[PDB]
Amino acid sequence: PISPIETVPVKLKPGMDGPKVKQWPLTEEKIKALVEICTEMEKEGKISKIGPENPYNTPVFAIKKKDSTKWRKLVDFRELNKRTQDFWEVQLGIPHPAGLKKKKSVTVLDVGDAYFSVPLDEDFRKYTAFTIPSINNETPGIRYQYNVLPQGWKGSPAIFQSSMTKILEPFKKQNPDIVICQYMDDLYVGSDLEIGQHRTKIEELRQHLLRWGLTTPDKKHQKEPPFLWMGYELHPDKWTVQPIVLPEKDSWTVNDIQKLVGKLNWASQIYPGIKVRQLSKLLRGTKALTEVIPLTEEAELELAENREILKEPVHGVYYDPSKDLIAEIQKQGQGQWTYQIYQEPFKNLKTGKYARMRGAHTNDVKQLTEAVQKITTESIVIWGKTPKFKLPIQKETWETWWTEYWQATWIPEWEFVNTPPLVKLWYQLEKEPIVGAETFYVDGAANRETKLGKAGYVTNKGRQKVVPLTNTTNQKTELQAIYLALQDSGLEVNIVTDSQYALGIIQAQPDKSESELVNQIIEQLIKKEKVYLAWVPAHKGIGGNEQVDKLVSAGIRK
Amino acid sequence: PISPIETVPVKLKPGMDGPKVKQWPLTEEKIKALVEICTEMEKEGKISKIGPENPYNTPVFAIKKKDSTKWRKLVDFRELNKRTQDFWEVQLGIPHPAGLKKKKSVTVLDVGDAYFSVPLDEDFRKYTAFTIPSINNETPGIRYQYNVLPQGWKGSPAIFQSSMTKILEPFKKQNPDIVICQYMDDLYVGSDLEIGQHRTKIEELRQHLLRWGLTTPDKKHQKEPPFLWMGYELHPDKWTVQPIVLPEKDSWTVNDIQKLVGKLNWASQIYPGIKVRQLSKLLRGTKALTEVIPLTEEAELELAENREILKEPVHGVYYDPSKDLIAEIQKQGQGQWTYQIYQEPFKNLKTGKYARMRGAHTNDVKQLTEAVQKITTESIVIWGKTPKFKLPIQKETWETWWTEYWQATWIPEWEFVNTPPLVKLWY
Ligand SMILES: CC(C)=CCN1Cc2c(Cl)ccc3[nH]c(=S)n(c23)C[C@@H]1C
Secondary structure, three states, rough: OOOOOOOOOOEEEOOOOOOOOOOOOOHHHHHHHHHHHHHHHHHOEEEEEOOOOOOOOOOOEOOOHHHHHOOOOEOOOOHHHHHHHOOOOOOOOOHHHOOOEOEEEEEEEEEEEEEEHOEOOHHHOOOOOOOOOOOOOOOOOEEEOOEEOOOOOHHHHHHHHHHHHHHHHHHHOOOOOOOOOEEEOOEEEEEEEHHHHHHHHHHHHHHHHHHOOOOEEEEEEEEOOEEEEEEEEEEEEEOOOOOOOOOOOOOHHHHHHHHHHHHHHHHOOOOOOOOHHHHHHHOOOOOOOOEEEEHHHHHHHHHHEEEEHHHHHOOOOEEOOOOEEEEEEEEOOOOOEEEEEEEOOOEEEEEEEEEEEOOOEHHHHHHOOOOOOHHHHHHHHHHHOOEEEEEEHHHHHHHHHHHOOOOOOOOEEEEEEOOOOOOOOOOOOOOOOOOOOEEEOEEEEOOOOEEEHHHHEEOOOEEEEEEEOOOOOHHHHHHHHHHHHHHHHOOEEEEEEHHHHHHHHHOOOOOOOOOOHHHHHHHHHHOOEEEEEEEEOOOOOOOHHHHHHHHHHHHOOO | OOOOOOOOOOOOOOOOOOOOOOOOOHHHHHHHHHHHHHHHHHOOOOOEEEOOOOOEEEEEEEHHHHHOOOEEEEEOOOOHHOOOHHHHOOOOOOOOHHHHHHEEEEEEEEEEOOOOOOOOOOOHHHHOOOEEHHHHOOOOOEEEEEOOOOOOOOHHHHHHHHHHHHHHHHHHHOOOOEEEEEEOEEEEEEOOOOOHHHHHHHHHHHHHHHHHOOOOOEEEEEEEOOOOOOOEEEOOOOOOOOOOOOOOOOOHHHHHHHHOOOOHHHHHHOOOOOOOHHHHHHOOOOOOOOOOOOHHHHEEEEEEEHHOOOOOOOOOOOOOOOOOOOEEEEEOOOOEEEEEEOOOOOOOEEEEEEEOOOOOOOOHHHHHHHHHHHHHHHHHHHOOOOEHHHHHHHHHHOOOOOOHHHHOOOOOOOEEOOOOOOOOOOO
């Protein structure tokens, strides 16, 4: 049958015209099929045979694809689809399972061939015209057109969604307490009603829709308790994704690493812990995907480390708006952090992690905060709340941290908790020039062409030093230069640099980086008691620079 | 209801397509408001539910107006306007009167409830497409349209100009110097009138207004005393770039002179007349930071000279109405903040500082958000336009909170600097 629903009008893109796409007449063999299939379709009302006053054509394909025992029909109006205007975005976003709430009974109904039942705007039909020639020559070119949403049509989905969205209305109005959601041509109806009593309404609906020519072949609401949605596997009280295998082989290539990494990130949501830093850092190579990737040891560690976790299967809970969402964090390692959102003690709702972002040298706290955000962000998108945060860090620390930073932020309601990794200010510079501390007019340089430099300085106490360097930038040398300053300096020190760079860098009070050079300086500052760094214009003619720059002659002259 | 007006036949700027912005997720508490708000509008036909034949969309936000009062809907009309209102501001060009900034006190009055009458060309509402979010994308989202004149839309005030004109004309005929200025749905009326004269003179208009078209305003101050805002009664005759003073370091120190020089060095870019050289000489040593070196008679002559070279500003004043104005913020100290708007790097038309000690409310974000808007005004006030804000904050952080403290009608285009300030001085 069909649905007497108020059709939706479609206009073709402004200044455009219907497809003149003819077809390489397919094998006269599968032509009898096309005809026989469309005769019924036409007899099912879905089609109206018309050939004269209509130029517009599209190719009619036909063969058999999956487990069926019959010939299938296909016709893609890609050409038309393009000529077609734009509608509303079907699913600009997928609902996240962790956001759902618990119900006693649920179920899913295949909305049959949803689209077909739905009527094409009376006009656009001319466009959906196609051609089924008889044989190779003996042929009248029997033309037909759709009166319903065609198999491969751009609007088809949008429309249909709208349609159904409507169709349910009165019903759902009358039967207010049974939430519904549609996905593709599928219907997810759930509620807190006694299996049979759940079955009571199911039918009521099943029937309701049936009044609209919408075919649902569910016998007594036929569904597989284990739901396979967007990878998730759901149940009226718990959700999880099961098919997740981290393959192990020898000839590890790129594509595989990526796949591993995708497969890994995916499970993280639910699996508390998963790491991917190395495996990912590795993928960093460019374009060649067919090549094999040398998973170094650091990699293997996290992999089988992860593997251990993956082996053991965990599950997640649903939402109860009558409670507080809670976000708890911890630093699982260098660069990596994790979170988990729960309502009641140890009943996992959601996990995941924030991977240290761009900006090579950062501070953990800053990072931690950068982390809290992502969390903040999700809770909104899901349960539209702000989870109260559980933060492994002191308030004095935090406080002083943000009271310091240049950029601005916002710490929600959060409590400090004692746990293993602790984010805190390791080192912390001075404010005013340290009295007595030997001043260090640190300097360095390098001839980019020569790829060689020199690091050194001259302390106020007529003291000098230098160290030549192979493979160094004016930048690297500068840090290096400060690093020396650090080594040679005492407990209290005044370091002076001409580095725009290092100036900023150290001031950023970052930590845990990949630049040994820096890591060291860091570790020294850590080791220290009172450092006062300061910055001045390299060539501006300060004599404090004049000399540290005048020593540069030992490499060359200019 | 059944009684309308005609429709200025509207059209987008030729060649462009309707806006298709993505609706930011908002809180449930916000959604609920918006469900309410827009339903009443479905009721009062000002707006209506649409279908899939429509793909456009423009952002919306819930906001507690005039001091956390019950909620207010806000469409982020930024794009559409830019897609219509621009070549449109070549026709209905609402004028900008310079001298206002010169006036002593100006107030703002939202003249938006007005537009909600005049219908819209049936072929343009198409663009008024706005969606309200279904938490966690569980539902398909409520999609409405606009039937009358949309508050955020820049094409609407332009239209309304007609009535507005006469609405005021008489009030203007009784009050001439009282300059009034319309920017979207806000009224800025300036005078050099004493506080209360101005004040009363204000409600005067408010009432007159109301009389002429149920153009109802906001009752900002009853006979009641409260700790509420001292109104949007700015005093633009007050604006300076003064505080960028050289520290008066009687105790000059190697460190200090250096610092000194440093500021002076970058400061050289904002005053190509300053030369610090002879001073640079005073610190040419490799001494102890904390050491006193005033001496150079020839140098302090430089201290003083440039020390005042500040007070006598440069050429940097050529408001290029073609170019866009750029705002830039500096988080100074506890509740200390700063900005500067220029169209060109050191051609900064005006700079200023925002102060509101982080304590009773230290939410940077809030103060930032506050500031922004407070800057926004100036700009409008003066050139009658919204700058481009360079926000010293995270996109994502900001993209999750301005909408909380944000109590303005319009929303300026902004961006975020992950670039710290060497510029960070006392200025
Ligand atoms: C994710 C999809 C298609 C959800 C549809 N879905 C069914 C469902 C399932 Cl399968 C598990 C827990 C669920 N929690 C909620 S609420 N629902 C729910 C209702 C909607 C009706």
